[PDB]
């Protein structure tokens, strides 16, 4: 028996692992990401200010991918109107909400609150990749509220845990209060990667504060929830083997451990479930509303999302969980131009789940 | 095909070779199957390094001697030099090529050259001809003089050369405005395709991926598996058996590996050998092209890398260039004008498409 | 040593062959084509009218794919104007030419004549898949003339060899005569599959008739040129092994042999190079203008295009030939919505080759 | 995982199972590893066919007996029947389901049911519940009563059932207008996912691919490799070792194979076993979804088919549904409401997306 990826062969990359489709390799090859991603020169245990500078360069790098890459598909739907709202969060900070809805559709519609990815730490809210995703979901028949929560790293200010989760919780409660004026029949929280982290952590926090009724369901895509990217080789091998299997496929454990450091600079939240929902116990997860957890086959993060979905099921939550074959981390939303069937499948399930939760409220 | 079907197969007898490919190789008696060197990679370092300096002289002599000219070559390009500081306080020379008398922004390409990261000079006529071709097609080309691992005056094993290439790419990114660049793509062949990929992975690790708009990896030398035994080569990367001896051969490549990573402790590090990168480390890279040659022993590791990029969601396009030994379109260009034309059009066009769309 | 695809394992399909990327499988799965394609109920040696009815149903089926599939990419360029011209062909038939050029670009531009696929037998000229391809090429800076040649099968009339090649030759000579009025600096003939057949056969016919000077270069994509799809298993194994390797991956030898029958109903053209350019000898190919031959890795047709490219090189033609990794037959143009890097790569090389031939005229 | 890591692993001891999955299986004592039948597939046909009729009775008894109801089930659907003629002059019943009191065109789905193409009745409450779920979500569903290979009154080996399914799909295509369909997608699970795929390949061969707008293949049973030896199963399709015994097992599936293809001469025909389709035969198919279950021995052949579709350029999306044995979401729906909900949303939504975009 030969295990896949870099479990079975340590020099495996996008160009030699036979799980990759031609289109996935082609998408990656656009930016030179068809080779194995290199660990950066800083380690996460280095001094904070050096860590944070490397985090800043990570933002630049990933943002230039988002701003530059081809996105368009010929089937894309664009008959969407947009509006913005401002609310205040816990520190008296202004939180922008970006609202998307189908043009010329009266009457109540499923609601989705979107928390975007970037490891809770990097990437701008209002950029073309996030707008496309929100428009896709609105054109399928949703009202979509994209939250601009504070990133842990910005050029003008460090905002470690728990500022973003508080910001996302503020927005969910606001939307819940404004179901009537917004014209919503349900509220689902969705997001990918760091946004999947924030979607689950927001739900856990709402439960702690007695306002679990604000959330009708959670769709956690490719969640980034272990915080385990600096663990030694043997712990990653035995506990979350996808962190060895697919390491360096687009994203890489070294760069992720820098973001972990920016989010929790002391490390006193490492086994706190609001920071890192991989450590939620079953008694904490009891009584949550319905979940989907979707992970991607070729993502180092795959095994932590599957573990979370298995613990939900043990806790008696209605969870359906899926592994999306052939995809690197983020591929359906970032590399959608090369992968129309994968994007179509993700839109259908996120919009459909938001419609199912509203129907059965 | 090749030495899978018949162990005695060679350039004169394998029917996938064109007459022009055989003629090019016959120039230096390379139309016979290349023989293993008499030093092994598991010998002492001093003896290995001597044999690698011998190799440098051998390949450098082909580059310095061979016919290289084509009637369609374009020559109206301006050159200059910059000098930057590397990680050791070493000076790194940058050779800059641009089309004479074009104003306004142009696509940029950072070129990392071949030679197993270990041999061959940076400023030589083969490399200059390639950078002039690209610049004449409407690019600004920055060729990087990284430290090789073997030099007559010293040993520079991993990671010196990849640090030198990252330093150059981040300098060029900071000078987009004053160089006049609308994009930065990193491109190289063979050892330089290793470096282009390894520099991009190292930039991702350090938070500086936004410096690189796209990667063009040509005939990449990325497994480090040239000393593996026959059965491991046959089942994991069958081109290392199929085409072994066709211009290059595994015995001599294994010497370069030992020079690069003399302790063998980076054999499965993806920054040294990008073939071991996991799918999770390749998530979120910019667009890639991977081009490999059909009659090259390195073919199958480049394809394996391209399939894993696609599984990771990277926009990759991957091609096998028919009838070509390793390096044939840049070294044996004089014999293969259409092969050279096709590789110039793809690399220059890729750069333009990544500048257009950033 | 294990050979790939169905050489190494006879039950191989899109879902189990590890050469397929996730995106390629997803594209195929849209229409249920992620399973191995079944041989139709008619054989090519059955009676003509039964053959031709099955050919008619093949047209319906493939046309409904073209008319229905998602196509759009967010990077698509649309600033193209279109005009039409009518010329007459050899039988006094009206031949429509559909002309595409970049809006608002004065001055001479590389010309491309496009002959579309469908095995010379099926698929309409003016449909959304062909228009997209022509617009893509025009927006890259080309004048593109799409020829509506007669198909061998239509509802109202059988038109076997050599009506289409004559129609394509008429159009190439017309365009050559109208370089000045059209504003062309070069004329390249390109096409895919049956169109690649017609691009090469047109060139061979122009050479026979003394008007090889009309054509500055040929780009033959995924050519369908052996006519060998009914050959027994052993001949296909020994001579063109991709006809065993990838049979049933989107297209299938059985259905192709029906189209062969429609193109040459008697079979007296089976080893005629104008019908089936796989049988061109080296002395025939001597003196042709520069060629590209591009084949796809996962196409049953792959090995006949590679053989043709190797014979060109032996004949002293300047040929560059490429295998596009990870792709089924037609994937870059038909399944472009899922494979943006592969489409981008094909546009760049076809437009670039047309610009190179015009430059060096 | 599973019996790769520990040969004694079972539903009670493998930690990938949820409590609800184990509870569902315990109903009929299926929480123990299933045992090989005492007839082998290489025994005489008469003895094989008897053992297969025994299997029919066994599975049919589970379908006819088990709790199936969920509180959210929708029931406002109208049924009718049509009868068409097959290739042998056999009558084929079509069961038609549509949402009561909706006018105007709806997405269509042709449903081919499971049972290895050999066992299980068409009109039974498990199948009816699945077609009512889909129709209630806003589809017209046509369930096809194809000939099984085993019947108490006769043997119908390949290709009778796939001819019956093609006949139905072409009839539905010709009646789009009078059925009121905006699209035709073919969907089935297990043996019926074999048929949905094999019907599409047969339509392509006969020139009639435009009848099918898209295929949804659920937990497809497509290799026919259940009698292969352990080492061939371990290296080619490791889930046939990993999950063997989890609800279904290879010994009993090999009996169904012999019933379908009693001479063994269609073992590598793709119309019988779509896993052997080449990439060239899968070129030009309409969009696909392939869904497989994690704890199913058939998992890995479905994934292998999905990767080969993607290599052929077909728009495929492929998913592994976590924590589920073979057939769990349609047979054990009463225990697994979220798994059922997710599969209804995907199959009905896929149909709507293919009707929208045709």
Q: Which residues of D touch C4 (CB under 8 A)?
A: none
Give yes or no for a contact between B282 and C286, defined as CB atoms under 8 angstroms apart. no
Contact A22 B307 (CB under 8 A): yes
Q: Nearest C-alpha of chain A: how many angstroms from C337? A: 5
By the 10 Å C-beta count (0-12 exposed, 13-18 middle, 19+ buried), B62 is classed as: middle
As a 3-state breakdown, chain D gives helix, strand, coil percent values, each rounded to 5, of 40, 20, 40
Q: Which residues of C touch B349 (CB under 8 A)?
A: 348-349, 352
- B with C: how many residue pairs have Cβ under 8 Å apart? 100
Q: For this experimental structure, what is the resolution in angstroms?
A: 1.9
Smallest CA-to-CA distance from B218 within A78, A190, A32, D127 is with A32
CA–CA separation, B229 vs D122, rounded Å?
Answer: 56
- Interface check for B311 against chain C (CB to CB < 8 A): the answer is yes
Q: Quick one: tokens of A251?
A: 């994203």
Residue in this structure with the two tokens 């429609």, named with its chain if needed: C262
Smallest CA-to-CA distance from B219 within B98, B161, B305 is with B305
Give yes or no for a contact between C279 and C273, defined as CB atoms under 8 angstroms apart. yes
Smallest CA-to-CA distance from D223 within D321, D155, D303, D115 is with D303
* Adjacent-strand bridge partners of C221: C192, C294
Question: Best of C6, C14, C342 to disrupt the D interface by mutation (most D CBs within 10 Å)?
Answer: C14
Which residue blocks in B226-273 are alpha helix, DSSP H? 230-236, 239-242, 250-260
Range A79-85 contact pairs with CB under 8 angstroms and sequence separation of 24 or more: A79/A103, A79/A104, A79/A139, A80/A135, A80/A138, A80/A139
CA–CA separation, B131 vs B120, rounded Å?
Answer: 16
110-129 of D, contacting C, C-beta below 8 A: none
Alpha-carbon distances of D325 from D8, D60, D167, D228, D332, rounded to whole Å: 17, 18, 32, 22, 9
Give SS3 for B300.
helix
Q: Which residues of B touch A323 (CB under 8 A)?
A: none
Give yes or no for a contact between C187 and C180, defined as CB atoms under 8 angstroms apart. no
DSSP C290: P
Smallest CA-to-CA distance from A6 within B218, C3, D301, B274 is with B274
168-197 of B, contacting A, C-beta below 8 A: 185-186, 196-197
- C with D: how many residue pairs have Cβ under 8 Å apart? 482
* CB hemisphere CA count around A170 (13 angstroms): 22
> What residues have CB less than 8 Å from C17, skipping those under 6 apart?
C4, C5, C298, D279, D304, D307, D308, D311
Q: Nearest C-alpha of chain A: how many angstroms from B20? A: 30
* CB hemisphere CA count around A107 (13 angstroms): 2
Dihedral pair phi/psi, residue A129, rounded to 5°: -65, -45
**Nearest beta carbon to residue D234 from set A1, A340, A341:** A1
For D33, other C-beta atoms within 10 Å of its C-beta total 18
Contact C19 D185 (CB under 8 A): no
Give yes or no for a contact between B312 and A331, defined as CB atoms under 8 angstroms apart. yes
- Interface check for C258 against chain D (CB to CB < 8 A): the answer is yes
User: For B287, which residue in chain A has the nearest alpha carbon?
Assistant: A30
Q: Quick one: tokens of A211?
A: 């306002």
Give yes or no for a contact between C226 and C278, defined as CB atoms under 8 angstroms apart. yes
List chains touching B (3+ CB pairs under 8 A): A, C
- Interface check for B19 against chain C (CB to CB < 8 A): the answer is yes
Domain count, chain C: 1
Q: Quick one: tokens of A134?
A: 């929100």
Compute the CA torsion angle B277, B279, B284, B289 (nearest 10 deg): 70
Q: Nearest C-alpha of chain D: how many angstroms from C210? A: 37
User: For D292, which residue in chain C has the nearest alpha carbon?
Assistant: C15
- Interface check for B219 against chain A (CB to CB < 8 A): the answer is no
Alpha-carbon distances of B92 from B88, B146, B237, D225, rounded to whole Å: 10, 7, 35, 60
**Nearest beta carbon to residue B201 from set A10, A36, A330:** A36
Contact D310 A319 (CB under 8 A): no
Smallest CA-to-CA distance from B200 within A16, A330, A70, A36 is with A36
3-state SS record for D76-88: CEEEEEEEEECCC
> What residues have CB less than 8 Å from D270, skipping those under 6 apart?
C11, C13, C35, C36, C37, C38, C247, C248, C252, D198, D201, D276, D277, D278, D281
Range A203-211 contact pairs with CB under 8 angstroms and sequence separation of 24 or more: A203/A288, A203/A289, A204/A273, A204/A274, A204/A277, A204/A280, A204/A284, A205/A165, A205/A169, A205/A274, A206/A169, A206/A172, A206/A173, A207/A284, A207/A287, A207/A288, A209/A169, A211/A173, A211/A176
> What residues have CB less than 8 Å from C59, skipping those under 6 apart?
C118, C121, C122, C123, C153, D207, D210
Give yes or no for a contact between D308 and C249, defined as CB atoms under 8 angstroms apart. yes
Q: What is the full DSSP assignment across D304-352?
A: HHHHHHHHTT-EEEEEEEEEEETTHHHHSGGG-HHHHHHHHHHHHHHHH
CA–CA separation, C9 vs D278, rounded Å?
Answer: 10
Find the CATH number of the domain harbouring B252.
Answer: 3.40.50.1820
Q: Which residues of C touch B319 (CB under 8 A)?
A: 322-325, 345
Give SS3 for B108.
strand
**Nearest beta carbon to residue C321 from set B307, B323, B357:** B323
- Interface check for C25 against chain D (CB to CB < 8 A): the answer is yes
Give yes or no for a contact between A198 and A120, defined as CB atoms under 8 angstroms apart. yes
- Interface check for D267 against chain C (CB to CB < 8 A): the answer is yes
**Nearest beta carbon to residue A29 from set B236, B287, B301:** B287
> What residues have CB less than 8 Å from B332, skipping those under 6 apart?
B21, B24, B25, B66, B325
Contact C252 D281 (CB under 8 A): yes
Alpha-carbon distances of C84 from C87, D15, D91, rounded to whole Å: 10, 67, 52
Question: Best of C19, C21, C220, C357 to disrupt the B interface by mutation (most B CBs within 10 Å)?
Answer: C21
- For B145, the domain range is 1-358
Q: Which residues of D touch A303 (CB under 8 A)?
A: none
Compute the CA torsion angle C252, C257, C258, C259 (nearest 10 deg): 90
For B96, other C-beta atoms within 10 Å of its C-beta total 18
Q: Nearest C-alpha of chain C: how many angstroms from A136? A: 13
Q: What is the full DSSP assignment across D53-80?
A: HHHHHHHHHHHHHS----TT----EEEE
Q: Quick one: tokens of B170?
A: 């981040």
Contact D345 A348 (CB under 8 A): yes
Contact C27 A72 (CB under 8 A): no
For A80, other C-beta atoms within 10 Å of its C-beta total 17
Dihedral pair phi/psi, residue B92, rounded to 5°: -115, 120
Smallest CA-to-CA distance from A334 within A238, A221, A253 is with A221
């Amino acid at each position: 028996y030969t295990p896949p990826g870099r479990l079975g062969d340590e020099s495996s990359g996008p160009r030699t692992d036979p799980r990759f489709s031609p289109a996935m390799v082609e998408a990656l090859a656009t930016f030179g990401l068809d080779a194995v991603a290199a660990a950066p020169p800083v380690s996460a245990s280095d001094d904070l200010p050096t860590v944070l500078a490397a985090v800043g360069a990570s933002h630049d790098g990933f943002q230039a991918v988002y701003d530059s890459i081809a996105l368009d598909l010929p089937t894309d739907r664009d008959d969407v109107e947009t509006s913005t709202e401002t609310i205040l969060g816990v520190d008296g900070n202004e939180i922008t909400l970006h609202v998307f809805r189908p043009a010329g559709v009266e009457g109540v519609l499923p609601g989705l609150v979107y928390t975007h990815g970037g490891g809770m730490t990097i990437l701008t809210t209002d950029n073309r990749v996030h707008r496309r995703w929100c428009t896709d979901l609105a054109a399928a028949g949703s009202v979509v509220v994209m939250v601009d929560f504070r990133n842990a790293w910005t050029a003008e200010g460090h905002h470690p845990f728990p500022s973003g989760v508080e910001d996302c919780l503020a927005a969910v409660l606001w939307v819940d209060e404004h179901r009537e004026s917004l014209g919503l029949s349900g509220v689902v929280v969705q997001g990918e990667s760091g946004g999947g982290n924030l979607a689950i952590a927001t739900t856990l926090l709402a439960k702690r504060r007695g306002r679990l009724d604000a959330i009708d369901g959670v769709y956690a895509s490719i969640p980034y929830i272990s915080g385990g990217y600096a663990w030694d080789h043997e712990r990653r091998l035995t506990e979350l083997p996808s962190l060895v299997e697919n390491d360096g496929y687009f994203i890489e454990n070294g760069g992720m451990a820098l973001l972990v450091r920016a989010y929790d600079p002391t490390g006193e939240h490492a086994e706190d479930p609001i920071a890192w929902p991989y450590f939620a116990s079953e008694d904490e997860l009891r009584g949550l509303p319905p979940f989907v957890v979707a992970v991607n086959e070729l993502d180092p993060l795959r095994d932590e999302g599957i573990a979370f979905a298995r613990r939900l099921a043990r806790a008696g939550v209605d969870v359906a969980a899926r592994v999306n074959i052939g995809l690197v981390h983020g591929a359906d939303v970032i590399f959608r131009h090369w992968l129309p069937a994968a994007l179509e499948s993700t839109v259908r399930d996120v919009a459909g789940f938001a419609a199912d939760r509203a129907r059965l409220r």
